[PDB]
């Protein structure tokens, strides 16, 4: 359950793994987690997948209503502020946490957002079950001044660190670039007897 | 008939136009000019947000209710989103609640034209008790509003506004009579010019 | 807190011991359990003391509002039923009692527990001592019973209950609801 | 304030509510419609409001029941919505499809409440109910625009309801109709009610309610069939 | 025209004006902003310890606005701590005064009242609130029956450097000229330390003298 | 309680299957208890929730199906129950719905579950079917794999079994 | 709601006019006992002669005759019974007639939707002995000695004015109502043309049987 | 807004208008037959293209039927609610009291108008009881009563004339005074413990033909 | 304890006549019969008022329907109705603890009895039982019962089940209120 | 208030709604055509004072991924109506997860406009608006009006001189026409009676790009 993000020079490479487990059994070996809040902004989720999916749908309808109304593509901080509030109000009944990344003319922002409602932008963030293992690799390896393509070589290995070392997290890496230059979804991205009839 | 907001046989709300006539009988004559770099307003100056101001024009009492509503919404914006409400969004929302007066027959249109100024470049929105809002380029609202609009159409920004009020109300002012508010590119802080 | 009741061809007799207690201290031995609602039908009190008074005050009130409005008597079936409904609402609130509706209608005896157990039998004893009171009760009880023999039966069965139940002491308090209605048939002592 | 209120729940000195009388007259402005019961099925002809070229009323209350809406369109939609809700709530807890007579009583309770209290305008729209409730077989009901309902063997509603229904008084013989006779009489009366001698395919549309092989099915007629009935009409003339 | 929500065609609601007439009847109150303090006089309410009020227009309604102003001062002291500024108090009470004008059901106020307050930062402040909910600061105010008639003598005064000490007599003097007159006077200036308080009885007796 | 919910998608035919039993505790009540309610759905978990969600869903679905004679898309149905159950996230009903059936007129299968094949229920199944699944089966085959997975997972399982129902949805035929 | 320019309310004075189309009712107070009396108010012959009723019990000690709008009366009557039993439940004493009447007066003009048209005559023998409180629909109760309420009642008022007696005997006071009801009525009074109810100092309130009425 | 504000007459507007509204209803005859109750209604207006609240209580409303069912539904909820609270079923009198209280309520209310019906509530206790209830909320016991259009003339027809014979009364009032209708008339005798029971038109011919002989 | 059998042209249901709080039974006449229509018959084991506070609450609706619609509900229809109520009460403040058998006989759908869990788990039952004596009895009835039977034979099949509740079970439930439902409608036995 | 300002005329006409149709008669002309590549909607707007803005308040406001509106009537009323239309669309997306069918959004919004013809203290919406949409294989062109009656169209017109605009639309155009070719009839029917325009196709809803409007 290793989700991650990094703020590279032109934006944010979000990264995710395709697994969701109901405890000790994998129920979904191709789980979509880098949910599209908006074409500009995307949000990975971790913790309970139900809370994360549904809360992301709520903020999606919300953000897409505000941008639909102004006709101006929404800011990242806006997304974060309503997320801060949304995850605060329940006071831990929404126990699923979110890594929002987006770009607005104001440029890149990537806030890890803990399920009690702390929003903290930082150059690297990780979350999920795999986060400890992932963040040590993001700490050791992340450098400011990193380029655009090397982030692909920085989140695929970091998420891979959570794929092997952890047992909640596994399966194909998803990697979703955020830049005003281009958006990229790479849905399945990185791969690291017959019961005879009649 | 002409008392409860309902449509006339001409498809025309009587109480709404009565509110426009009430704005004209408020006796004030506001003008604003959108320069490239500055957004003069002149007349009742208000500071709806530290980055946004507006001048109400009409019934004096009526102005304050919508001023407070504008501050309520402007503050609530930042509370849910976290950036200055655009001038367009603020004018849109206040217009949307002024329509409530019109949709409901219980309560009555507040007669105050609302000339917002502020930089989202510079903006000069109008709002009517109708619930209609639009960005002008050089608005005026008030008594001699039509006589000013010609002079605006014919058309340094501060000069445009001040000579417009001078020529159009046909009176040479004292500085206390003309309250003036500027919002320069470098000064998004709403500020009374202070000629 | 024993309150036997049984019906037979010449009446319904309702006897009750007069002891009331808090802890192993006995606050009084004076209470008459058979709280009145109606000249010709009557209550009981088992379980907590305050509950029965209060509920049967509400019962007496509602029976009175009914008798005025409907302009007829409230029946033992109806009386117990309104009672049973009213005590149900406070089920899980610990308002525990073992009130009984008795009265000539033929005779009607309906035991009415606090959890809403409005059951119609003919022969009851309610309370702590009931298990004692029951065993004596069945042994003399017949529907073929004289008003006097029944008086003795109610008194023996209460007397044998109070003899063993630590929390039941005090004098036997018969009420006899015959055809006409109730009378304070005996209030006589146990310490005889 | 309340000085404006015209009441619209008032009771009049002639002894007949104002809005109820006005609701009856709103329907006369409404276009012709008619439903015709038979011993095997229940027809519902209706006339598409105008023939207008560049435009590209019966609804599915259930699959075993359906309504025709006559008096107005904007209100009708809300009526149909409430009908679908009542029917599907009844299907929710009782787990059997609503019997049609009941569904009519429910909507007529909702209608009656608007006259009785609240100072709100009543729905002015007379309805028909074609249906096949389990307990009675095929049935047709008409809802006056105040609460009423009348199980009818054939009825018309809309413009010239009076001439049309009176025409069916003697022209609908009792308890003899195979569905074939229902189509014949339908096409007759809808033909006679309009000033157009025969009617075009952009005029009639007929939802026949037919017990389709042990699963009752409502079907709007397919226009090619609508035109065989009309083409038969041209020779019925 | 007779109902408040309706506008008369010309541009006003006549109900509000009929409610305005009520204070045009009642006798003159006269407060005077001064080099320190506002001497209210009315030929008084402790809105707060800080703030004084001098009502005019029918008294019945005036007390309710007094009580609302006391409530407003208290909510401000609790939520914010610090004693309410008059420039905000006027605007709040005036807002509440304004709400009536806007809806048919409640009637506009009859009153108009000059609340005033001496405070350290602001200095003296003398705001009068109309039943429309139009509040302005003043240098002098006088409302009532002798409305411009008092205004000519407060115009004759030039407080800007008159002390509060002359004014405690002068309010009563203006009252006597426009005016038998029961006299009331108030002092709110820094000698009174912003404690809204009636004039000391000897000076008040002298003032009538 | 519970019950098992087999579901499997091989070729346009959409398999789904279920045990027909439920237990009051560890005692079987009925050897016939419907779990697959007709684009089909098979709920398992509590019986109270099985019945509650089946009722509530058919209601919400019929309001739509009358409002448009347009048949429901499988994805929208998935959203329908997804939203319907997430409304109780404070009091969540315990039942696991696994829809299976065609996307209208394109004859395209859509199976899914909600908190290849999707198994859910009290079960035994996820490890059993996974390497047996063939990505192409005629219904004749599809019945065979799902019947094996069903019978083998469930005969072992204590609280499921004692009757099997198998719908292999196809436009051409729906075998049981 | 509108106080007329002449002071007093409109709907109330119209409700007072509604009493004039209400049954005549004498409200005798003997100092022995209470004797509420009312014309049957029957006009129709196949309308029952023993199921029509005018005077209702409230407590065992308070009777309650009614006049004006007969349907409206029963709401205030039922609420009066609820009040009295509530008094019994809280204080175990029975509610005296002064407060039984007062509680009903409190509800009388609570229209913020329309006033009741009823005149009421509570009669209850309470520890003071006989008491007879008339209740106007203006929300005004008043202690009485003899007040007759209703339509030909003004003539019954003035008739009472000569015959009212210091003290009074129970049976003699009853005979007064039996004679005056013949005058106020258009027809010759018959025991099926009156419904009398009496409360002797010691008894609980009794609807009077007809045979006794002929005498 | 208060709707039924008193007139300067002392009358109530909506109420008297409602009294004239039941007069437009059809002639709901009833009589409390000594044996059993019998009641009936008339003027169905047959185009040929065309209550019981308990097993004791039954109803024969006149007025506008649109309102009448709406009254009876609430009355039926009241019957069943009473059977659960008192053990025994509701008596006819208690029904009459509630319906009368219910009708009264809407006059003293905001925005409501009196129910325009005047119900002939009827029912066994096993003694017949034949109440009238009118919009005002007045309810009176009767032994004969008939409310409807021309029903007043029928009550007078009864007054001068007051199983087969009670049915003869119910028919006779209508087949002499009101228009002769072998289908318009729908009398229903209620037997003592058999639920109110209509007859087939041919069974009504016991007197519908015998009156032709009389 | 409650027992139910589905037969060719009947539904057979029977009930122990008992209740006990404490060590003693306080009645042996207690009717776990809750007859509600001519051919719709609840039988409710369960503790306290909830069994009858529910039973009657259903009854008055089931009856209210019959007056208001002029016809009687199906055994299935009544079953799904009570099922709905129990599901609502499970999530409620008051979850009733009533285990009931809704016997009934539709004419054109035929005889049907339904087991209903307290939680609310309706299921059609070929034969069923409730209570705690259900653990004992259901095996006898499951072994013995066939598709055919007769009402004459139903009596023997039921009499054999009575033996289990005395002979092997701890509690004494001594009289059984046997009753049938047949096209004719309900009869006591 | 609580009392509706909509009440029938003596023959059953909703006077206030008819007056709302008069308000539709005002407002600048609108036009909309279903062509076969995609619908186009367009409207007159004017400089008026020459100090205005043209991108401030388009009458052409997107509602959902491929729906849009164009209004005729009062402009103030449109601003809020659009808001509720967007509410219904986004609410539908979170429940159903597909952008709502054109026909359904028109229906739901029609119900909103119907509520005020029955709801207390409110007048009916003056605005009438084309609601043009394209789902699946079909371009949808709808007309909602003040009473909440709505119709799908193949070509339609609104505002001033719709009366002639519709006439041109049935003779100058029929069947199908490639999208700019069916814009030919827009620009030339609108001519009968500054301008904003917006088109649908299958390219995400779209405002006809300003350089190419020219």
Curated annotation (Swiss-Prot), chain A:
Active site: 1 (nucleophile)
Organism in which the protein naturally occurs: Homo sapiens (Human)
GO molecular function: endopeptidase activity; threonine-type endopeptidase activity
Subcellular location: Cytoplasm; Nucleus
Tissue-specific expression: Expressed at a low level in colonic mucosa. Up-regulated in colorectal cancer tissues.
Catalyzed reactions per annotation: Cleavage of peptide bonds with very broad specificity
Residues of the whole record sequence present: 44 to 250 of 277
Superkingdom, taxonomy of origin: Eukaryota
Cellular component GO terms, alphabetical: cilium; cytoplasm; cytosol; extracellular region; ficolin-1-rich granule lumen; nuclear body; nucleoplasm; nucleus
Subunit structure: The 26S proteasome consists of a 20S proteasome core and two 19S regulatory subunits. The 20S proteasome core is a barrel-shaped complex made of 28 subunits that are arranged in four stacked rings. The two outer rings are each formed by seven alpha subunits, and the two inner rings are formed by seven beta subunits. The proteolytic activity is exerted by three beta-subunits PSMB5, PSMB6 and PSMB7. (Microbial infection) Interacts with HIV-1 Tat protein.
Gene that specifies this protein: PSMB7
Keyword Chaperone: no
Keyword Cytoplasm: yes
Entry keywords, A to Z: Cytoplasm, Host-virus interaction, Hydrolase, Nucleus, Protease, Proteasome, Threonine protease, Zymogen
Family: Belongs to the peptidase T1B family.
Protein name: Proteasome subunit beta type-7
Main location, first listed in the record: cytoplasm
Any single GO BP term: proteasome-mediated ubiquitin-dependent protein catabolic process
EC number in record: 3.4.25.1
Curated annotation (Swiss-Prot), chain B:
Domain of life: Eukaryota
Record SUPFAM superfamilies: N-terminal nucleophile aminohydrolases (Ntn hydrolases)
Chief localisation class: cytoplasm
Subunit note: The 26S proteasome consists of a 20S proteasome core and two 19S regulatory subunits. The 20S proteasome core is a barrel-shaped complex made of 28 subunits that are arranged in four stacked rings. The two outer rings are each formed by seven alpha subunits, and the two inner rings are formed by seven beta subunits. The proteolytic activity is exerted by three beta-subunits PSMB5, PSMB6 and PSMB7. Interacts with ALKBH4.
PANTHER family: PROTEASOME SUBUNIT ALPHA/BETA
Function, as annotated: Component of the 20S core proteasome complex involved in the proteolytic degradation of most intracellular proteins. This complex plays numerous essential roles within the cell by associating with different regulatory particles. Associated with two 19S regulatory particles, forms the 26S proteasome and thus participates in the ATP-dependent degradation of ubiquitinated proteins.
Record localization: Cytoplasm; Nucleus
Gene that specifies this protein: PSMA6
Key words, A-Z: Acetylation, Cytoplasm, Glycoprotein, Nucleus, Phosphoprotein, Proteasome
Modification type N6-acetyllysine: residues: 78, 80
UniProt xrefs under PROSITE patterns: PROTEASOME_ALPHA_1 (PS00388), PROTEASOME_ALPHA_2 (PS51475)
Pfam families reported in the protein's UniProt record: Proteasome, Proteasome_A_N
Coiled-coil ranges from the UniProt annotation: none
Name of the protein this chain belongs to: Proteasome subunit alpha type-6
Residue numbers bearing the Phosphotyrosine modification: 132
A cellular component annotation (GO) from this entry: nucleus
Protein source organism: Homo sapiens (Human)
Positions of post-translational Phosphoserine modification: 8
One GO molecular-function entry: purine ribonucleoside triphosphate binding
Sequence similarity: Belongs to the peptidase T1A family.
The keyword Glycoprotein is assigned to this record: yes
Curated annotation (Swiss-Prot), chain E:
GO CC terms: cytoplasm; cytosol; extracellular exosome; nucleoplasm; nucleus; proteasome complex; proteasome core complex; proteasome core complex, alpha-subunit complex
GO MF entry, a single one: ubiquitin protein ligase binding
CDD domains per record: proteasome_alpha_type_3
Domain of life the protein comes from: Eukaryota
Extent of the signal sequence: none
Induction: Down-regulated by antioxidants BO-653 and probucol. Up-regulated by bacterial lipopolysaccharides (LPS) and TNF.
Alphabetic keyword roster: Acetylation, Cytoplasm, Host-virus interaction, Nucleus, Phosphoprotein, Proteasome
Main location: cytoplasm
Family under the similarity heading: Belongs to the peptidase T1A family.
Protein name according to UniProt: Proteasome subunit alpha type-3
Provenance organism: Homo sapiens
Lineage, opening ranks: Eukaryota, Metazoa, Chordata, Craniata, Vertebrata
Curated annotation (Swiss-Prot), chain J:
Coarse class of the protein's main subcellular location: cytoplasm
GO cellular component, one term: proteasome core complex
Coiled coil: none
PTM-bearing positions, type Phosphoserine: 2, 9, 11
Sites of N6-acetyllysine modification: 65, 166
Entry's Gene Ontology BP terms: proteasome-mediated ubiquitin-dependent protein catabolic process; response to virus
Transmembrane segments: none
Domain of life, per lineage: Eukaryota
Induction remark: Down-regulated by antioxidants BO-653 and probucol. Down-regulated in response to enterovirus 71 (EV71) infection (at protein level).
Residues bearing PTM Phosphotyrosine: 1, 19, 71, 116
SUBUNIT field: The 26S proteasome consists of a 20S proteasome core and two 19S regulatory subunits. The 20S proteasome core is a barrel-shaped complex made of 28 subunits that are arranged in four stacked rings. The two outer rings are each formed by seven alpha subunits, and the two inner rings are formed by seven beta subunits. The proteolytic activity is exerted by three beta-subunits PSMB5, PSMB6 and PSMB7.
Similarity section: Belongs to the peptidase T1A family.
PANTHER family named among the record's database cross-references: PROTEASOME SUBUNIT ALPHA/BETA (PTHR11599)
Name of the protein this chain belongs to: Proteasome subunit alpha type-2
Natural source organism: Homo sapiens
Gene: PSMA2
């Amino acid at each position: 359950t290793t989700i991650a993000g990094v703020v590279y020079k032109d934006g944010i490479v979000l990264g995710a793994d395709t697994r969701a487990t109901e405890g000790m059994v994998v129920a979904d070996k191709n789980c979509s987690k880098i949910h599209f809040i908006s074409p500009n902004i995307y949000c990975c989720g971790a913790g309970t997948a139900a809370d994360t999916d549904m809360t992301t749908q709520l903020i999606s309808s919300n953000l897409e209503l505000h941008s639909l109304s102004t006709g101006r593509l929404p800011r990242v901080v806006t997304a974060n502020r309503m997320l801060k509030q949304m995850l605060f109000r329940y006071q831990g009944y929404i126990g699923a946490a979110l890594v929002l990344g987006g770009v607005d003319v104001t440029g890149p922002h990537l806030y890890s957002i803990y399920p009690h409602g702390s929003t903290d932008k930082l150059p690297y963030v990780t979350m999920g079950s795999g986060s400890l293992a992932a963040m040590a690799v993001f700490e050791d390896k992340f450098r400011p001044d990193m380029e655009e393509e090397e982030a692909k070589n920085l989140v695929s290995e970091a998420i891979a660190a959570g794929i092997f070392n952890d047992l909640g997290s596994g399966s194909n890496i998803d990697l979703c670039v955020i830049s005003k230059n281009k958006l990229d979804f790479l849905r399945p991205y990185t791969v690291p007897y017959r019961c005879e009839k009649g | 008939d002409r008392h409860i907001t309902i449509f006339s046989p001409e498809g025309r709300l009587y109480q709404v136009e009565y509110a426009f006539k009430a704005i004209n009988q408020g006796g004030l004559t506001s003008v604003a000019v959108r320069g490239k770099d500055c957004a003069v307003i002149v007349t009742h100056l208000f500071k709806i947000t530290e980055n946004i101001g507006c001048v109400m024009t009409g019934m004096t009492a009526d102005s304050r209710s919508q001023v407070q509503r504008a501050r309520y919404e402007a503050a609530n914006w930042k509370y849910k989103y976290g950036y200055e409400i655009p001038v367009d969004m603020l004018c849109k929302r206040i217009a949307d609640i002024s329509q409530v007066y019109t949709q409901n027959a219980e309560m009555r249109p507040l007669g105050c034209c609302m000339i917002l100024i502020g930089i989202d470049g510079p903006q000069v929105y109008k709002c009517d008790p109708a619930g209609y809002y639009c960005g002008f380029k050089a608005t005026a609202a008030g008594v001699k509003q039509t006589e000013s609009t010609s002079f605006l159409e014919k058309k340094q920004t501060v000069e445009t506004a001040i000579t417009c009020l001078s020529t159009v109300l046909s009176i040479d002012f004292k500085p206390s009579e003309i309250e003036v508010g500027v919002v320069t590119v470098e000064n998004p802080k709403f500020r009374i010019l202070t000629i | 807190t024993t309150t036997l009741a049984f019906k037979f061809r010449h009446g319904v007799i309702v006897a009750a011991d007069s002891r009331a207690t808090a802890g192993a201290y006995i606050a009084s031995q004076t209470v008459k359990k058979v709280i009145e609602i109606n000249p010709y039908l009557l209550g009981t009190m088992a379980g907590g003391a305050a509950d029965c008074s209060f509920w049967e005050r509400l019962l007496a009130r509602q029976c009175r509002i009914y008798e005025l409005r409907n302009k007829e008597r409230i029946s033992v079936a109806a009386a117990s039923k309104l009672l049973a409904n009213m005590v149900y609402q406070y089920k899980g609130m610990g308002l525990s009692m073992g009130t009984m509706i008795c009265g000539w209608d033929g005779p009607g005896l309906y035991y009415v527990d606090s959890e809403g157990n409005r059951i119609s039998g003919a022969t009851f004893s309610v309370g702590s001592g009931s298990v004692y009171a029951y065993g004596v009760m069945d042994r003399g009880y017949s529907y073929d019973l004289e008003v006097e023999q029944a008086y003795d039966l109610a008194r023996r069965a209460i007397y044998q209950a109070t003899y063993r139940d630590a929390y039941s002491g005090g004098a036997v308090n018969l009420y006899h609801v015959r055809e006409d209605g109730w009378i304070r048939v005996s209030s006589d002592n146990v310490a005889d | 304030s309340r000085r404006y209120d015209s009441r619209t729940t008032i009771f009049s000195p002639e002894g007949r509510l104002y809005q109820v009388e006005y609701a009856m007259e709103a329907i006369g402005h409404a276009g012709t419609c008619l439903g015709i019961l038979a011993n095997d099925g229940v027809l519902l002809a209706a006339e598409r409001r105008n023939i207008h070229k560049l435009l590209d009323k019966i609804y599915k209350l259930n699959e075993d029941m359906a309504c025709s809406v006559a008096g107005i369109t904007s209100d009708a939609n809300v009526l149909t919505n409430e009908l679908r809700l009542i029917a599907q709530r009844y299907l929710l807890q009782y787990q059997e499809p609503i019997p049609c007579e009941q569904l009519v009583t429910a909507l007529c309770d909702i209608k009656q409440a608007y006259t009785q209290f609240g100072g709100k305008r009543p729905f002015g729209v007379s309805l028909l109910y074609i249906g096949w409730d389990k307990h009675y077989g095929f049935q047709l009901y008409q809802s006056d625009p105040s609460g009423n309902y009348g199980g009818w063997k054939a009825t018309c509603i809309g413009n010239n309801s009076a001439a049309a229904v009176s025409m069916l008084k003697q022209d609908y013989k009792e308890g003899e109709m195979t569905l074939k006779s229902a189509l014949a009489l339908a096409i007759k009366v809808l033909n006679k009610t309009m000033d157009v001698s025969k009617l075009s395919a952009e005029k009639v549309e007929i939802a026949t309610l037919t017990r389709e092989n042990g699963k009752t099915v409502i079907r709007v007629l397919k226009q090619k069939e609508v035109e065989q009935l009309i083409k038969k009409h041209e020779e019925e003339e | 025209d007779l109902s408040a929500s309706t506008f008369s065609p010309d541009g006003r609601v006549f109900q509000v004006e009929y409610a305005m007439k009520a204070v045009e009847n009642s006798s003159t109150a006269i407060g005077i902003r001064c080099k320190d303090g506002v001497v209210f006089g009315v030929e008084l309410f402790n809105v707060d310890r800080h703030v004084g009020m001098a009502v005019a227009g029918l008294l019945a309604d005036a007390r309710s606005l007094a009580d609302i102003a006391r409530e407003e001062a208290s909510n401000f002291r609790s939520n914010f701590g610090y004693n309410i500024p008059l420039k905000h108090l006027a605007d709040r009470v005036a807002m509440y005064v304004h709400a009536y004008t806007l809806y048919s059901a409640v009637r506009p106020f009859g009153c108009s009242f000059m609340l005033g307050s001496y405070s350290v930062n602001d200095g003296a402040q003398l705001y009068m609130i109309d039943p429309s909910g139009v509040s302005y600061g003043y240098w002098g105010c006088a409302i009532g029956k002798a409305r411009q008639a008092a205004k000519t003598e407060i115009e004759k005064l030039q407080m800007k450097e008159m002390t509060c000490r002359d004014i405690v007599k002068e309010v009563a003097k203006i009252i006597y000229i426009v005016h038998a007159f029961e006299l009331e006077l108030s002092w709110v200036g820094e000698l009174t330390n912003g404690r809204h308080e009636i004039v000391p009885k000897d000076i008040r007796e002298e003032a009538e003298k | 309680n519970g019950g098992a919910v087999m579901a499997m998608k091989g070729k346009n035919c959409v398999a789904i299957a279920a045990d027909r039993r439920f237990g009051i505790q560890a005692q079987m009540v009925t050897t016939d208890f419907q779990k697959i309610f007709p684009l089909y759905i098979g709920l398992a978990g509590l019986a109270t929730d099985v019945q509650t969600v089946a009722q509530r869903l058919k209601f919400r679905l019929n309001l739509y199906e009358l409002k448009e004679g347009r048949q429901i898309k499988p994805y929208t149905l998935m959203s329908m129950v997804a939203n319907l159950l997430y409304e109780k996230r404070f009091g969540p009903y315990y039942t696991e719905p696994v829809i299976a059936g065609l996307d209208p007129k394109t004859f395209k299968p859509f199976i899914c579950s909600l908190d290849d094949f999707v198994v859910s229920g009290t079960c035994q199944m996820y490890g059993m079917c996974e390497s047996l699944w063939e990505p192409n089966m005629d219904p004749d085959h599809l019945f065979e794999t799902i019947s094996q997975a069903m019978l083998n997972a469930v005969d072992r399982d204590a609280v499921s079994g004692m009757g099997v129902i198998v719908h292999i949805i196809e436009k051409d035929k729906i075998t049981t | 709601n509108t106080f007329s320019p002449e002071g007093r309310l409109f709907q109330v004075e119209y409700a007072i006019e509604a009493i004039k189309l209400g049954s005549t009712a004498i409200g005798i107070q003997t100092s022995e006992g209470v004797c509420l009396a009312v014309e049957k108010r029957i006009t129709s012959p196949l309308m029952e002669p023993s199921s029509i009723e005018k005077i209702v019990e409230i407590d065992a000690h308070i009777g309650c005759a009614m006049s004006g709008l007969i349907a409206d009366a029963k709401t205030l009557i039922d609420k009066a019974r609820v009040e009295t039993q509530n008094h019994w439940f809280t204080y175990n004493e029975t509610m005296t007639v002064e407060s039984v009447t007062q509680a009903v007066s409190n509800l009388a003009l609570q229209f913020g939707s329309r006033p009741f048209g009823v005149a009421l005559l509570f009669g209850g023998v309470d520890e003071k002995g006989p008491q007879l409180f008339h209740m106007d629909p203006s929300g005004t109760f008043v202690q009485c000695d003899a007040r007759a309420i209703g339509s030909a009642s003004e003539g019954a008022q003035s008739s009472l004015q000569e015959v009212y007696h210091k003290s009074m005997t129970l049976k003699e006071a009853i005979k007064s109502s039996l004679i005056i009801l013949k005058q106020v009525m258009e027809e010759k009074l018959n025991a099926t043309n009156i419904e009398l109810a009496t409360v002797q100092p010691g008894q609980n309130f009794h609807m009077f049987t007809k045979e006794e009425l002929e005498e | 807004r208060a709707i039924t504000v008193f007139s300067p007459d002392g009358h109530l507007f909506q109420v008297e208008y409602a009294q004239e509204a039941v007069k437009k209803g059809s002639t709901a005859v009833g009589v409390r037959g000594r044996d059993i109750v019998v009641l009936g209604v008339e003027k169905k207006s047959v185009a040929k293209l065309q209550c019981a609240l308990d097993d004791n209580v039954c109803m024969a409303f006149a007025g506008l039927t649109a309102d009448a069912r709406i009254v009876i539904n609430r009355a039926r909820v009241e019957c069943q609610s009473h059977r659960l609270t008192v053990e025994d079923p509701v008596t006819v009198e208690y029904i009459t009291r509630y319906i009368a209280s219910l009708k009264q309520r809407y006059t003293q209310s905001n925005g409501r108008r009196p129910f325009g019906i005047s119900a002939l509530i009827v029912g066994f206790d096993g003694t017949p009881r034949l109440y009238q209830t009118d919009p005002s909320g007045t309810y009176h016991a009767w032994k004969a009563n008939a409310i409807g259009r021309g029903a007043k003339s029928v009550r007078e027809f009864l007054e001068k004339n007051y199983d087969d014979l009670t049915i003869k009364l119910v028919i006779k009032a209508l087949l002499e005074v009101v228009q002769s209708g072998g289908k318009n008339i729908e009398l229903a005798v209620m037997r003592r413990d058999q639920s109110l029971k209509i007859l087939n038109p041919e069974e009504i011919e016991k007197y519908v033909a015998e009156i032709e002989k009389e | 304890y409650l027992i139910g059998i589905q037969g060719p042209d009947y539904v057979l249901v029977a009930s122990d006549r008992v209740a006990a709080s404490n060590i003693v039974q306080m009645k042996d006449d207690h009717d776990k019969m809750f007859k509600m229509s001519e051919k719709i018959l609840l039988l409710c084991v369960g503790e306290a008022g909830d069994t009858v506070q529910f039973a009657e609450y259903i009854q008055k609706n089931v009856q209210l329907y019959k007056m208001r619609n002029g016809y009687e509900l199906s055994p299935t229809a009544a079953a799904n109705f009570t099922r709905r109520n129990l599901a609502d009460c499970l999530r409620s403040r008051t979850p009733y603890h009533v285990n009931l058998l809704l016997a009934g006989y539709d004419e054109h759908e035929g005889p049907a009895l339904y087991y209903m869990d307290y939680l609310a788990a309706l299921a059609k039952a070929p034969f069923a039982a409730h209570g705690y004596g259900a653990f004992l009895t259901l095996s006898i009835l499951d072994r013995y019962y066939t598709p055919t039977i007769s009402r004459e034979r139903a009596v023997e099949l039921l009499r054999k089940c009575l033996e289990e509740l005395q002979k092997r079970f701890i509690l004494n439930l001594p009289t059984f209120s046997v009753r049938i439902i047949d096209k004719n409608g309900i009869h006591d036995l | 208030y609580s009392f509706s300002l909509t009440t029938f005329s003596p023959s059953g006409k909703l006077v206030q709604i008819e007056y709302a149709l008069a308000a539709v008669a005002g407002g600048a002309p609108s036009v909309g055509i279903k062509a076969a590549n995609g619908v186009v909607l367009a409207t007159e707007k004017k400089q008026k004072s020459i100090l205005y803005d043209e991108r401030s308040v388009h009458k052409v406001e997107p509602i959902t991924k491929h729906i849009g509106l164009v209004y005729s009537g009062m402009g103030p009323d449109y601003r809020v109506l659009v808001h509720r239309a967007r509410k219904l669309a986004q609410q539908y997306y979170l429940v159903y997860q597909e952008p709502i069918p054109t026909a359904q959004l028109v229906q739901r919004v029609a119900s909103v406009m119907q509520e005020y013809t029955q709801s207390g203290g409110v007048r009916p919406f003056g605005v009438s608006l084309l609601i043009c949409g394209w789902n699946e294989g079909r371009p949808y062109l709808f007309q909602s009006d003040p009473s909440g009656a709505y119709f799908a169209w193949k070509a339609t017109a609104m505002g001033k001189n719709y009366v002639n605009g519709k006439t041109f639309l049935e003779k100058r155009y029929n069947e199908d026409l490639e999208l700019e070719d069916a814009i030919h009839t827009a620009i030339l029917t609108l001519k009968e009676s500054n301008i904003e325009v917006g088109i649908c196709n299958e390219a995400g809803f779209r405002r006809l790009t300003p350089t190419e409007v020219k």
